[PDB]
A paper describes a structure:
To generate a stable complex for crystallization, we engineered a custom construct linking CHCHD4’s N-terminal interaction domain (N45) to the dimer-permissive AIF (104-613) W196A mutant which maintains an open C-loop. The AIF-CHCHD4 chimera crystallizes in conditions resembling the original AIF-W196A mutant, allowing the structure to be solved by molecular replacement. The structure reveals the expected conserved AIF dimer. The CHCHD4 N-terminal domain is resolved for both AIF monomers, allowing the first 30 (Molecule 1) and 20 (Molecule 2) residues, respectively, to be modeled into the electron density. The structure reveals that the dissociation of AIF’s C-loop exposes a unique binding surface, allowing CHCHD4 to form a hydrophobic scaffold around AIF’s C-terminal domain. The CHCHD4 N-terminus assumes a unique β-hairpin/helix motif when complexed with AIF with a buried solvent accessible surface area of 1440 Å. The first twenty residues form a β-hairpin, which pairs with the core β-sheet of AIF’s C-terminal domain in a parallel orientation. The interface with AIF is mediated by hydrophobic side chains of β-hairpin residues I12, I13, F14, and V15 which complement the exposed hydrophobic edge of AIF’s C-terminal domain. The helical turn is anchored by a histidine (H20) which inserts into a hydrophobic pocket formed by AIF residues I610, V507, V564, and A604 and makes a water-mediated contact with N602. C-loop boundary residues F508 and Y560 contribute to AIF’s hydrophobic binding surface, forming an aromatic tetrad with Y347 and W351 as previously observed in crystal structures of the activated AIF dimer.
Residue numbers in the entry: 127 to 511, 558 to 613, 999 to 1030
The structure:
Amino acid sequence: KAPSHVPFLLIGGGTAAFAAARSIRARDPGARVLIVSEDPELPYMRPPLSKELWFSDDPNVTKTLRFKQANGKERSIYFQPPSFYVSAQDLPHIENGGVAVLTGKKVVQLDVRDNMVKLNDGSQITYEKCLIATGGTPRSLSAIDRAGAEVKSRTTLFRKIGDFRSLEKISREVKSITIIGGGFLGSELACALGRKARALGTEVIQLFPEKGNMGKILPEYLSNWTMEKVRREGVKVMPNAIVQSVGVSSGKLLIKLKDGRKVETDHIVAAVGLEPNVELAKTGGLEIDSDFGGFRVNAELQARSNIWVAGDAACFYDIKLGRRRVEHHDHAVVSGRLAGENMTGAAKPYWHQSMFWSDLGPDVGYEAIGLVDSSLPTVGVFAKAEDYGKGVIFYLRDKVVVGIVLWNIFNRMPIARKIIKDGEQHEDLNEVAKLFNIHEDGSMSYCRQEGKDRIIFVTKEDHETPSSAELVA
Ligand SMILES: Cc1cc2nc3c(=O)[nH]c(=O)nc-3n(C[C@H](O)[C@H](O)[C@H](O)COP(=O)(O)OP(=O)(O)OC[C@H]3O[C@@H](n4cnc5c(N)ncnc54)[C@H](O)[C@@H]3O)c2cc1C
């Protein structure tokens, strides 16, 4: 039972909303914050759904939804125990405030002038400050939408706890699973499913239009190296694949590609991008970004007076890097926190950069920051003992580093932040790479230029010489 009025209203019960709620409470100890969540589940982190929860030793991981971190500490996907929240009944009156989550309730109408929303059940809530943190909904393929009810019921869109539970069940009861999508989600699920299938010898297929996995973010040579790694996890990878039609044939899904090839499979998992949830822009009169999608907000994540946007749904202005829309866990954290600080009057711009990460089997793990885009010219520095095992990849624009990928090297994000912040025009990025110490614990080094991409292979002796890189202090 929601209150008629609440000081802080958070639309969406995901990662960005929770971070904003924690941030608001940290700056305003008496704050009373209401999260309106369409989802019946309380706020939870999503990255475990495509990684750690598939690799748990526990047979009941599907019910406990607990996973063990790299440090060995078991954790819950939920951000907080249910007890840490207060009920919506008590939110207006409980001493020193708190955070309540109204679950199973969708905001369907937004009035920015009168600072009011309406829920799917007719309730109306007025607010003083409002955060839109609606995230996005998985996109679908046109060929899937034309295939009818049978195919659509055998096609999974992966995002929620429920999606993990249903796919985990299917993985134990079918013989072939086909993943459509080459990005981080399609690739992470392929490695997880591929690893589950090694025991029973079942089939796992991944197909996508690009030349290789992660083709939109990684340079072509590293995308190819990565594809071979995914293939080595027991996955049949089909690059250069454009789905022309899908149908059911003799109890089995049959995918037809423009190439002419054909795939027969028992279940499809479609990981082909995200659609920002901008339905409230119509009633609210809020602007949507035509180039990036999502609500257009400024550097402070503000859309209009008393209304902010954070997370996957927010197209914001980065003072250093330009207008962006970022769909990553740590961004939802950073943006939700920034929005909460600004809802309490901080008026701070996006400055501390968000990062992201992925793991594609045991041989591929990276962190990244900034404009990681494979269309940009790049300089990649890899350790020489072609093996792309450990290294750092710089993404350039106007001779300036605007994005960095840390390839199988960890705890280097501090250095990567400084490089992005300073914005220097470096004459030799091999000198900058020395700061990352990619050989921690005798032939000559060499380099190669493959179109827009430079590839430097550096030995320990050369890499651990003094660096002339310019750092701003
Ligand atoms: C399986 C998976 C694995 C991932 N792995 C990684 C990873 O390894 N690294 C990484 O950096 N990122 C990863 N991500 C991305 C990261 O999880 C997302 O960027 C993050 O969840 C975005 O949080 P959010 O708050 O912006 O949106 P969401 O988490 O989508 O939260 C939005 C919530 O609001 C609800 N909602 C929508 N509209 C309304 C409305 N009108 N009223 C009320 N509620 C509404 C939605 O139902 C949803 O519950 C992964 C995502 C998924 C799905």
